[PDB]
Amino acid sequence: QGVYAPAQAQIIHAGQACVERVYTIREGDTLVLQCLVTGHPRPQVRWTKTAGSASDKFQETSVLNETLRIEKIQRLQGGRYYCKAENGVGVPAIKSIRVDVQYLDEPVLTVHQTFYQEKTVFLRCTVNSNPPARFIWKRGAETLSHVDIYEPLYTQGETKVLKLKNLRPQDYASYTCQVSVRNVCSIPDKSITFQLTNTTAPPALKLSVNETLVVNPGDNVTMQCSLTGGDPQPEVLWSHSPGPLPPNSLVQGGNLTIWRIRVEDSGYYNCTAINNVGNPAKKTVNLLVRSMKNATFQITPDVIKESETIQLGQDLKLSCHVDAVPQEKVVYSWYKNGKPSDRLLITRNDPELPPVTCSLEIIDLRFSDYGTYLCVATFQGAPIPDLSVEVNISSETVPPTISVPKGQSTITVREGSRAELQCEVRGKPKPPIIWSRVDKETPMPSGTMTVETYDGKLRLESVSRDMSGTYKCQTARYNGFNIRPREALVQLNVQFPP
Amino acid sequence: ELVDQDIQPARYHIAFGPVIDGDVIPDDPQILMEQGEFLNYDIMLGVNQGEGLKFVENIVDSDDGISASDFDFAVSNFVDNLYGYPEGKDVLRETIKFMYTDWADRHNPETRRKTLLALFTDHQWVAPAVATADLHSNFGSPTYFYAFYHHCQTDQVPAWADAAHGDEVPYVLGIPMIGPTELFPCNFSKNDVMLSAVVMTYWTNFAKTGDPNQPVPQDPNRFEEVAWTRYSQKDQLYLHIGLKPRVKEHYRANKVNLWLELVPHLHNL
Amino acid sequence: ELVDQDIQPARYHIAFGPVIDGDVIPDDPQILMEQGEFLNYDIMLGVNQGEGLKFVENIVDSDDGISASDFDFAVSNFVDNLYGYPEGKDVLRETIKFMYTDWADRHNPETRRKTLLALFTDHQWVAPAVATADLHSNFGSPTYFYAFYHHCQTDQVPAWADAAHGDEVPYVLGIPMIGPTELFPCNFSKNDVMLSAVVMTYWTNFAKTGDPNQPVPQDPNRFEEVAWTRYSQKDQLYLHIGLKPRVKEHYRANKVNLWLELVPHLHNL
Ligand SMILES: *[C@@H]1O[C@H](CO)[C@@H](O[C@@H]2O[C@H](CO)[C@@H](O[C@@H]3O[C@H](CO)[C@@H](O)[C@H](O)[C@@H]3O)[C@H](O)[C@H]2NC(C)=O)[C@H](O)[C@H]1NC(C)=O
Ligand SMILES: *[C@@H]1O[C@H](CO)[C@@H](O)[C@H](O)[C@H]1NC(C)=O
Ligand SMILES: *[C@@H]1O[C@H](CO)[C@@H](O)[C@H](O)[C@H]1NC(C)=O
Ligand SMILES: *[C@@H]1O[C@H](CO)[C@@H](O)[C@H](O)[C@H]1NC(C)=O
Ligand SMILES: *[C@@H]1O[C@H](CO)[C@@H](O)[C@H](O)[C@H]1NC(C)=O
Ligand SMILES: *[C@@H]1O[C@H](CO)[C@@H](O)[C@H](O)[C@H]1NC(C)=O
Ligand SMILES: *[C@@H]1O[C@H](CO)[C@@H](O)[C@H](O)[C@H]1NC(C)=O
């Protein structure tokens, strides 16, 4: 190719700048970079950026334009940009440039108090700035070693501390941290002052409720968090974990009220006071709303005889469980065609099975034991309702078996439409089915590894090809026999156009 | 009138106490020991795992942890009070912080508390004790060294605290054998009695023969087969006194040598 | 004519090699990495236990040990060449000597050899590698870190040497599977073949999926139940590659942080 020439790029500076390879501008101004290019055929030009996907100044910024334009630039918009120019002939042309947005936030001034001869206060001054800031201390007059100044470790020049080793009376004055960025990009210095007095003291709080607070649903609970010390006057703030405070909870400021409290509102509510003096004070209360859910039973045939079925002359455990908030406070009652038990039939409250599960054993099973058993979980004198689980034992009760009906082992569907996977379980009682995926370890439409279902149906509203694969269905270990779960597989084809 | 006066000394120092008069105390103990200007007594000495509890107890937040800023402050106060050198205190503070920083789990405020406690413990108790033991044994004094890693926690001390300054006294005095006292109210356990018996056996054995192992054997007693070897500067063997006792070597050698060899060097001679 | 010329560079540096031209290499790698000015590739990196064998191999006496004076000399040469600072090299040399001195068994010339070797290894290989891994993971690059603690000793290397620079190459290339070669004459053992298979499995797994654990499982093979967790600056998990493999945390955290945080500070900013 005689005349065809490889691309050649050159970056030029424009828009607002300040003062070699780097383009420094003040935050809020406008960036204008132009990429002049040559070569034949005329190469195309795109400005792009290079930034770690998962941290700090990152944007996905691919513009097809010989001019890069960022109006009202920001901290994060900063970084390294490269102009790429190609035309097919030879190697693409690349030129790099570092845009260095500069700034100087308002400094923060905090102070801390502290043998037994001299009292010492530390005045810490912190500020975020680009470039690194310069600190100057003054007590009306500029201070030098004549007390000590320095930068501690675990600070990249953003912090300086003024140490007052001996706190003499003249030192009780207004200290002001004046931080400068060398006026580069014509950026003004900034100052913050603090009134150091012998009454200056960190915050302190008092809470109107105990460490841990138990409550019933619907109850209204109000918590007064009041200051008991602090100069300057600290600011009190409430917070919640996990998640935010509302709905149905309002902060007057100091006063925290929760109306018609729901069970999900349980958790930690922390009151914190701050005045930029010492460590902030924090009072913490753990609010527990009572609840009972998911009552479940288990049929456990003779384990030592290695049985999976009810057989006369064997041990038969009938367990019971419920999920509760004050888990330690639950109590179970076992009824049997009415409410009775010493000989032959015995109670056991805490075996290897899930936590706090009451389970009676029937030694030497007998036709006389064939009946309807009931377990009743309750809270000692709580307004909440009781929960129960019925479990009929009879000659009919039998461990389960699972299979795929007819020939729906492999079921094909077109993408987008709805899909319905099917397993059918047999036994008395029938436990729920737990669906999982086997070809890979991925989650599901519900977003978790497994889904519960009683009808043995797995419904897929918007079936995606990603779902195409193999699926496992198996019997639960609860609400039925506590036995090796029975398994069965089904294939799911998600057809899609070519 | 003299007692009620308020006389505050420099931090970590004393106002009224023993002085170098050139008679009772012929010279600086450091000089006398380095030059071996002392008779050869039989010596037994030791320190506790967490001597410096009170050093950090006052700077601990409501979460039982210490902030990075508080840590810096403590060291800063520490350097100024003990190392009042005008030129070079900066490099010192930074070096000290690095050594007593746990770079594995460096962000944990509670680990920060432990290492800070260790700094004060190492400087005020461990380093001087090792220096004494090293010089005594080197100059021919029969030496025995111990580290006390046990105590009885009262409801007045933090649950996270280890054996603190003075916590060995009750064991040495056999207080556990007569149960809790008005002065020592901790609910001593069977293990406390057992350990107390052991300490008293070792202490009185030393008094009887100059050997903690003679004449009374340690008679389940975990010290049955544990002979307390003499301390020497080369092997620096010491007895680890606890519920799992055994002889070890070079107690905190790394941190001890920092204070005894490197820091003095940074003084610029 | 150009190749045969004698051009000696500064010690521990190069004369002819990659340069910062502002185009191919936009800026100092240190600045680019600190400011996260790089794309997020999948990264795997590591170092060997005893990289710096040749660093001390030449100063070892007939007893396989290093004298205290030779140790001082090596450090002195080390400080001057890498840290050409006029004011303060004294405190630096002394601090470096202290950190790399084993105060438990401080008189052993052979232990002295090991720690000196570690100094060069830590500075030239471990510290830079950790810095790279820390920055890559911090900026979102999937990172995997390893430490190679195995090798096949030929009759040409000292019996006391650990895995040296380049010793992992034969395993990565599967040389043990085809037996000793003219280039790699070591009499590879069954364990060498097993480890070689493992390394190749991990390396190619990374290439296939970006995950050393997928898709080929480690199929007695001691890596059967050992999943290589991703590296992060907080936990800094890495794979210990040897005949007893397992995942650890914060590889040589203490010594690594010395070079990456404290020493730079001693520069006086
Ligand atoms: C109601 O409560 C029952 C507990 O009585 C819940 O059943 C439990 O479900 C979890 C996860 O679905 C099971 O965890 C399992 O742990 C084993 C550990 O060996 C593991 O191999 C399994 O893959 C699974 O992760 C747990 O075993 C199971 N407990 C029993 C007794 O079956 C049930 O999910 C709750 N349902 C609702 C709607 O609240
Ligand atoms: C390039 O961008 C500038 C402003 O960013 C615009 O004025 C111009 O029309 C654009 N031209 C092309 C060819 O993209
Ligand atoms: C503090 O200063 C005030 C002056 O406002 C003075 O009245 C007081 O005695 C001083 N001492 C204390 C402990 O407040
Ligand atoms: C809770 O407050 C509502 C109004 O805010 C009131 O009607 C209700 O009776 C209160 N209930 C309790 C249990 O305090
Ligand atoms: C409240 O404090 C607890 C510990 O006391 C802590 O686990 C929780 O994260 C805190 N919540 C908030 C919002 O600060
Ligand atoms: C607390 O604040 C709520 C609103 O936030 C208010 O309705 C209630 O009357 C207040 N009670 C007290 C005791 O402050
Ligand atoms: C079990 O027996 C009880 C006894 O009244 C009956 O009500 C129930 O329908 C039976 N079947 C069950 C619980 O599935």
Residue numbers in the entry:
A (entry chain B): 19 to 37, 45 to 139, 147 to 178, 184 to 377, 381 to 538
B (entry chain A), C (entry chain A): 358 to 576, 584 to 633
Give the text the authors published on this PDB structure.
Members of the presynaptic neurexin (NRX) and postsynaptic neuroligin (NL) transmembrane protein families form the axis of a signaling pathway that is crucial for the formation and function of excitatory and inhibitory synapses throughout the brain. MDGA proteins bind NLs and control their function and interaction with NRXs via unknown mechanisms. MDGA proteins are attached to the postsynaptic membrane via a C-terminal GPI anchor, and their large (∼900 amino acids) extracellular domain consists of six immunoglobulin-like domains (Ig1-6), a fibronectin type III-like (FnIII7) domain, and a memprin, A5, mu (MAM8) domain. The extracellular region of the NLs contains a cholinesterase-like domain that forms a stable interaction with the α/β-NRX1-3 LNS6 (laminin, NRX, sex-hormone-binding globulin) domain (Araç et al., 2007, Chen et al., 2008, Fabrichny et al., 2007).
We performed an extensive crystallization screening of the NL-MDGA complexes formed between MDGA1-2ECTO and NL1-2ECTO constructs from various species, and succeeded in generating diffraction-quality crystals and determining the structure of the Endo F1-treated complex formed between cMDGA1ECTO and the human NL1 cholinesterase domain lacking splice inserts (hNL1ECTO; Gln46-Asp635) at 3.30 Å. The hNL1ECTO-cMDGA1ECTO complex has a 2:2 stoichiometry and overall dimensions of ∼180 Å wide, ∼110 Å high, and ∼120 Å deep. The NL1 and MDGA1 C termini point in the same direction and thus confirm an interaction in cis, situated on the postsynaptic membrane. The Ig1-3 domains mediate all MDGA1 contacts, consistent with previous domain-deletion experiments (Pettem et al., 2013). The smaller Site I (859 Å2 BSA) is formed between residues from (1) MDGA1Ig1 β strands C, F, and G and loop CE and (2) NL1 loops Leu289-Gln307, Ile377-Asp385 (part of “loop L1”), Gln392-Tyr398, and Phe496-Pro499 and helices α2(4,5) and α4(6,7). The larger Site II (1,000 Å2 BSA) is formed between residues from MDGA1Ig2 β strands A, B, D, and E and NL1 α helices α2(7,8) and α3(7,8); (2) MDGA1Ig2 loop ABIg2 and NL1 loops Ala110-Pro132 (“Cys loop”) and Asp361-Asp385 (“loop L1”); and peripheral interactions contributed by MDGA1Ig3 to NL1 α helix α2(7,8) and loop Val417-Ser424. The PheNL1430-PheMDGA1154 π-π sandwich stacking interaction is central to this interface and is lined by multiple hydrogen-bonding and charged interactions.
